[PDB]
């Protein structure tokens, strides 16, 4: 007989409990021994809150089986009372069941265990080996003999998640969705200096202690979408790295449309003729980014997008995490060149978009993603040259200071809105601009598109998050 071990505590990064192994009592029975005390069954079935006929039928229909479960996960008290009845053939196992003290606030990130206390979703699965420990062994007849192997308890795990920032993102996402009539969305917050995921919240959500498939989707890691205008900063990074474009260089986007063979690119804001590179992001001109893309070639844009991880495996090993797709056409005709440049030529997740913005914010160095508390930060990879990244940072700062609704009072912030397709309203950005600390992606699944919807969410979550992290105001 196996001796189940104590499963490791999961906490947030500051030690708040997120998943707790609490001792329970499980009752199993040997049917044939139970068959010799049938007069005891009704009171046993009563004590278990079980129907007498259902109970009696399960014993008899599993007659020659010598092992069946009567009930699992009783309180130590409830289990004590049953065992006190001294019913022949009724035996107890001291087990552990998981309880989730933060419930729906962090459901998808934490995940949960199965009936056997084995990780089945989220962190519980991803880190199951760390958390599980090793069962002990117990030899029996009927008579109990020896504990021939001890259970070794699982190990504690502190997530990267900051429950304070997680609750703020949860509250603000839920309010943004209700205000917009939206039914689904996600919000990711990442530490750009450490790679840590500080908050990862989805809607709808569920209480893991108490089901609908929409509620179980860890959307930040599995909802894949074309990121649209939110990847124009990486097209611009390619343009600045090509050697052919200064930030003050000009593109004529008049009249806000561009015909490529048969398709017509149409800008959302068509009151522009000459725009500099910052102006192309401020106006979010698909025409401007296309014309720049034609000049530098799609290879250089693909290459930046690949390097910052869009459409690439995040490496987290999180279960069910999706990768999206960044097609490598090798040579791109005009239409595919433009389409990649303004973000409809690829598919990404919110985690990926946030990681990509984190590398941009961290002066072009990508720090590896982590879902667990990072005490020793691994060396990052320089994926965009520091000069280009710092230049794109400044451009994105001007985008916010002018999408005025994204301004973060007390701080210089940077970011870019977009409309995703699969429509979703998006904002990706980071703050403070002078020494970036956190990056954020907001995804709102729309039933009044784009920047007008997602930017106030960014503003409010960033305002709260920077203050929760005691970031000194830089404005
Ligand atoms: C980006 O995703 N774009 C370009 C344009 N402006 O985007 S925004 O939502 O105003 O910031 C319109 C939507 C989408 C396209 N095409």
Residue of minimum CA distance from atom 13 in ligand 1: 419
Q: Which long-range contacts (CB under 8 A, 24 or more apart) does 378-385 make?
A: 378/195, 380/195, 383/304, 383/307, 383/308, 383/309, 383/359, 384/237, 384/241, 384/304, 384/307, 384/308, 384/359, 384/360, 385/241
Buried b (16+ CB within 10 A) or exposed e, 259-293: ebeeeebebeeeebeebbbbbbbbbbbbbbbbbbb
Task: Enumerate the β-bridge partners of residue 189.
Answer: 199, 440
Q: What is the resolution of this structure in A?
A: 2.1
Length of the chain: 475
Residue of minimum CA distance from atom 1 in ligand 1: 229
Question: Of 140, 158, 176, which residue constitutes the final position of a domain?
Answer: 158
Separation of 235 CA from ligand 1 center, angstroms? 15
Residue of minimum CA distance from atom 7 in ligand 1: 418
For residues 276 and 5, what is the distance between their CA atoms, to the nearest angstrom?
63
Handedness of CA 406, 312, 226, 176 (dihedral sign): negative
For residue 286, give the ligand 1 atom closest to its CA.
Answer: 4
Residue of minimum CA distance from atom 6 in ligand 1: 284
Same domain, 181 and 98: no
Ligand 1 test: best mutation among 180, 227, 229, most atoms within 8 Å of CB? 229
For residue 416, give the ligand 1 atom closest to its CA.
Answer: 11
For residue 232, give the ligand 1 atom closest to its CA.
Answer: 1
Same domain, 436 and 463: yes
Contacts of 405 (CB under 8 A, 6+ apart): 451, 452, 455, 456, 459
Which has the closest alpha carbon to 193: 236, 153, 160? 160
Ligand 1 test: best mutation among 267, 268, 420, most atoms within 8 Å of CB? 268
Range of the domain at 124: 2-158
Question: Of 141, 158, 175, which residue constitutes the final position of a domain?
Answer: 158
For residues 57 and 34, what is the distance between their CA atoms, to the nearest angstrom?
12
By CB neighbour count within 10 A (0-12 exposed, 13-18 middle, 19+ buried), where does 119 fall? buried
Same domain, 137 and 174: no
For residues 114 and 98, what is the distance between their CA atoms, to the nearest angstrom?
9
Separation of 229 CA from ligand 1 center, angstroms? 5
In a domain, 473, yes or no: no
For residue 418, give the ligand 1 atom closest to its CA.
Answer: 2
For residue 425, give the ligand 1 atom closest to its CA.
Answer: 9
Same domain, 146 and 187: no
Separation of 436 CA from ligand 1 center, angstroms? 25
Question: Of 132, 158, 184, which residue constitutes the final position of a domain?
Answer: 158
For residues 345 and 299, what is the distance between their CA atoms, to the nearest angstrom?
13
Ligand 1 test: best mutation among 226, 228, 267, 402, most atoms within 8 Å of CB? 228
In a domain, 474, yes or no: no
CB 438 within 8 A of CB 428: no
CB atoms inside a 10 Å sphere around CB 160: 22
For residue 420, give the ligand 1 atom closest to its CA.
Answer: 2
Which has the closest alpha carbon to 190: 316, 354, 363? 354
Q: How far is CA 441 from CA 2, 244, 351, 352, 354, in A?
A: 46, 30, 8, 9, 6
First CA to last CA distance, the chain: 65
CB atoms inside a 10 Å sphere around CB 178: 11
In a domain, 12, yes or no: yes
* Residue 257 structure tokens: 């449309």
Q: How far is CA 192 from CA 159, 233, 357, 370, 380, in A?
A: 16, 17, 8, 11, 11
Separation of 272 CA from ligand 1 center, angstroms? 15
CB 427 within 8 A of CB 186: no
Place of tokens 């844009």: 301
By CB neighbour count within 10 A (0-12 exposed, 13-18 middle, 19+ buried), where does 220 fall? buried
Same domain, 199 and 321: yes
Same domain, 227 and 353: yes
In a domain, 475, yes or no: no
* Residue 73 structure tokens: 């996960």
Handedness of CA 70, 73, 75, 77 (dihedral sign): positive
CB atoms inside a 10 Å sphere around CB 203: 24
For residue 454, give the ligand 1 atom closest to its CA.
Answer: 9
Residue of minimum CA distance from atom 5 in ligand 1: 268
Rg from Cα positions in the chain: 28
Separation of 460 CA from ligand 1 center, angstroms? 21
Q: Which long-range contacts (CB under 8 A, 24 or more apart) does 176-181 make?
A: 176/442, 176/444, 176/453, 176/456, 176/457, 177/203, 177/444, 180/425, 180/444, 180/446, 180/447, 180/448, 180/453, 181/447
Same domain, 150 and 267: no
Q: Is the peptide bond before 172 cis (omega within 30 degrees of 0)?
A: no
For residues 242 and 111, what is the distance between their CA atoms, to the nearest angstrom?
44
In a domain, 264, yes or no: yes
Residue of minimum CA distance from atom 14 in ligand 1: 419
Same domain, 275 and 332: yes
Residues in the ligand 1 pocket, defined by CB under 6 Å = 228-229, 268, 284, 286, 417-419, 450-451
In a domain, 270, yes or no: yes
Contacts of 434 (CB under 8 A, 6+ apart): 412, 474
Q: How far is CA 32 from CA 14, 51, 93, 300, in A?
A: 52, 20, 19, 74
For residues 326 and 311, what is the distance between their CA atoms, to the nearest angstrom?
5
Separation of 399 CA from ligand 1 center, angstroms? 13
Instruction: Give the chain's domain count.
Output: 2
Measure CA 22 to chain center: 26
Which has the closest alpha carbon to 337: 305, 280, 290? 290
Handedness of CA 404, 405, 411, 413 (dihedral sign): negative
SS3 labels along 150-218: CCEECCCEEECCCHHHHHHHHHHHHHHHHHCCCCEEEEEEEECCCCEEEEEEEECCCCCCCCCHHHHCC
SS3 labels along the chain: CEECCCCCCEECCCCCEEEEEEEEEEEEECHHHHHHHHHHHHHHHHHCCCCHHHHHHHHHHCHHHCCEEEEEEECHHHHHHHHCCCCCCEEEEEEEEEECCCHHHHHHHHCEECCCCCEEEHHHHHCHHHHHEECEEEEECCCEEEEEECCEECCCEEECCCHHHHHHHHHHHHHHHHHCCCCEEEEEEEECCCCEEEEEEEECCCCCCCCCHHHHCCHHHHCCEECHHHHHHHHHHHHHHCCCCCCCCEEECCCCEEEECCEEEECCCCCCCEEEHHHHHHHCCHHHHHHHHHHHCHHHHHHHHHHCCCCCCCCCCCCCCCCCECCCCCCCCHHHHHHHHCCCCCEECHHHHHHHHHHHHCCCEECCCECECCCCCCCCEECCCHHHHHHHHHHHHHHHHCCHHHCCCCCCCEEEEEEEECCEEEEEEEECCCCCCEEEEEEEECCCCCHHHHHHHHHHHHHHHHHHCCCCCCC
For residues 237 and 231, what is the distance between their CA atoms, to the nearest angstrom?
10
CB atoms inside a 10 Å sphere around CB 135: 16
Cα–Cα–Cα angle for 170, 437, 378, nearest 5°?
Answer: 105
Residue of minimum CA distance from atom 9 in ligand 1: 450
In a domain, 344, yes or no: yes
For residues 104 and 165, what is the distance between their CA atoms, to the nearest angstrom?
14
Active-site residues: which are they?
229
For residues 463 and 474, what is the distance between their CA atoms, to the nearest angstrom?
13
Which has the closest alpha carbon to 471: 433, 439, 437, 441? 437
Separation of 206 CA from ligand 1 center, angstroms? 32
In a domain, 31, yes or no: yes
Separation of 446 CA from ligand 1 center, angstroms? 14
For residues 85 and 202, what is the distance between their CA atoms, to the nearest angstrom?
47
For residues 464 and 475, what is the distance between their CA atoms, to the nearest angstrom?
16
CATH number at residue 109: 3.90.1310.10
Q: How far is CA 259 from CA 238, 275, 289, 334, in A?
A: 23, 19, 14, 10
Same domain, 205 and 322: yes
CB 475 within 8 A of CB 412: yes
For residues 9 and 96, what is the distance between their CA atoms, to the nearest angstrom?
12
Give CA torsion, residues 274, 276, 280, 281, to 10 deg. Answer: -160
Same domain, 118 and 189: no
Residue of minimum CA distance from atom 12 in ligand 1: 268
Task: Enumerate the β-bridge partners of residue 202.
Answer: 186
Same domain, 275 and 299: yes
By CB neighbour count within 10 A (0-12 exposed, 13-18 middle, 19+ buried), where does 254 fall? middle
Separation of 419 CA from ligand 1 center, angstroms? 5
CB atoms inside a 10 Å sphere around CB 95: 20
Ligand 1 test: best mutation among 346, 450, 452, most atoms within 8 Å of CB? 450
Same domain, 127 and 271: no
CATH number at residue 397: 3.40.710.10
């Amino acid at each position: 007989i196996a001796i189940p071990a104590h499963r490791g505590l999961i906490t947030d990064r500051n030690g708040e409990p997120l998943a707790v192994s609490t001792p329970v009592t499980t009752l199993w029975a040997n049917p044939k021994e139970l068959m010799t005390a049938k007069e005891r069954w009704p009171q046993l079935a009563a004590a278990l809150g079980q129907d007498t006929k259902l109970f009696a039928d399960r014993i008899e229909q599993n007659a020659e089986r010598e092992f069946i479960y009567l009930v699992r996960g009783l309180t130590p008290e409830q289990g004590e009372g049953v065992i006190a009845l001294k019913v022949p053939g009724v035996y107890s196992i001291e087990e552990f069941r998981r309880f989730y003290p933060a419930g729906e606030v962090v459901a998808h990130a934490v995940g949960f265990t199965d009936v056997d206390d084995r990780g089945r979703e989220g962190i519980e699965l991803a880190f199951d080996e760390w958390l599980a420990g090793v069962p002990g062994k117990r030899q029996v007849l009927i008579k109990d003999v020896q504990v021939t192997k001890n259970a070794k308890p699982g190990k504690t795990l502190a997530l990267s998640i900051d429950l304070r920032l997680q609750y703020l993102a949860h509250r603000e996402l839920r309010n943004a969705l209700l205000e917009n009539g939206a039914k689904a969305g996600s919000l990711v917050i990442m530490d750009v200096k450490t790679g840590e995921i500080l908050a990862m919240t989805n809607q709808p959500t569920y209480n893991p202690n108490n089901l609908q498939p929409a509620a179980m989707r860890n959307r930040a890691m599995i909802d894949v979408f074309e990121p649209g205008s939110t990847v124009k900063p990486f097209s611009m990074s390619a343009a600045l790295a090509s050697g052919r474009w200064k930030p003050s260089d000009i593109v004529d986007v008049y009249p806000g449309t561009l015909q490529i063979g048969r398709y017509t690119i149409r800008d959302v804001s068509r009151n522009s003729r000459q725009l500099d590179l910052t102006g192309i992001l401020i106006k979010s001109s698909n025409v401007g980014i296309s014309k720049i893309a034609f000049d530098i070639g799609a290879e250089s844009i693909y290459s930046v997008m690949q390097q910052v991880g869009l459409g690439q495996d995040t490496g987290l090993g999180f279960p069910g995490e999706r990768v999206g797709n960044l097609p490598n056409h090798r040579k791109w005709p005009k239409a595919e060149t433009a389409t990649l440049a303004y973000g409809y030529g690829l598919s990404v997740t919110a985690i990926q978009l946030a990681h990509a913005y984190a590398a941009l914010a961290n002066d072009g160095k990508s720090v590896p993603l982590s879902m667990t508390r990072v005490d020793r930060v691994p060396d990052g990879v320089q994926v965009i040259s520091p000069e280009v990244a710092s230049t794109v940072q400044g451009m994105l700062q001007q985008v916010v200071e002018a999408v005025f609704r994204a301004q973060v009072p007390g701080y210089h912030a940077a970011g870019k809105s977009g409309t995703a397709r699969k429509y979703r309203s998006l904002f990706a950005g980071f703050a403070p601009a002078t020494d970036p600390r956190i990056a954020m992606v907001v995804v709102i699944d729309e039933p009044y598109f784009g920047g007008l919807v997602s930017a106030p969410v960014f503003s409010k979550v960033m305002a709260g998050a920077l203050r929760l992290m005691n970031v000194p105001p830089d404005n």
